[PDB]
Design a protein around this ligand. Structure first.
Ligand SMILES: *[C@@H]1O[C@H](CO)[C@@H](O)[C@H](O)[C@H]1NC(C)=O
Lengths: 60, 49, 53
């Protein structure tokens, strides 16, 4: 597929540098991810990995 | 000195996925039909153009 | 499952259309209404959230 980008880091679109639980790790930087990758549906699948959230320390 | 810029535009609706009207254009039609023939004790039927 | 409403970046609105006409800080306020379903179905957007906290 195509990789997503937080303006310097070309990560896999559902696998950021903060894979997973982007909002728990970095809330306002996930908001900047929303501000930057609003064109990107793979970023929306990453958001879905925070909507059907599967964190590290949370077993769900 | 408190002001409010305000902004609006028009989009399509929720209906446009399945519920929509069609201004539609047509011209010279087609001549097809369907006929049943009794022929030698056979009520037999076909459909053609 | 499907815990989505942690990411509701607020649209915090002092509701003008509160009781008896005038305003109050109402989170139950309506923002968008859809009725164009031909079966008399009413899609109403409340400014609060249920289900997922
Ligand atoms: C054949 O079709 C005619 C109508 O066209 C009907 O009156 C008649 O009963 C039919 N006969 C048989 C044997 O199917």
């Amino acid at each position: 597929p195509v990789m997503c980008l937080l303006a310097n880091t070309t990560f896999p679109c559902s696998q950021p540098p903060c894979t997973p639980c982007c909002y728990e790790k970095e809330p306002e930087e996930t908001l900047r991810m929303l501000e930057d990758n609003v064109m990107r549906p793979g970023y929306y699948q990453l958001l879905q990995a925070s909507l059907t959230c599967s964190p590290h320390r949370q077993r769900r | 000195e408190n002001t409010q810029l305000s902004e609006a535009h028009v989009e399509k609706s929720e209906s446009c996925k399945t519920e929509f009207a069609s201004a539609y254009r047509a011209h010279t039609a087609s001549a097809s039909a369907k006929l049943r023939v009794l022929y030698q004790g056979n009520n037999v039927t076909v459909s053609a153009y | 499952n499907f815990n989505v409403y942690k990411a509701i970046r607020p649209y915090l609105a002092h509701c003008p259309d509160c009781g008896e006409g005038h305003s109050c800080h109402s989170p139950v306020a309506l923002e968008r209404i859809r009725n164009e379903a031909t079966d008399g179905t009413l899609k109403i957007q409340v400014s609060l959230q249920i289900g997922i906290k």
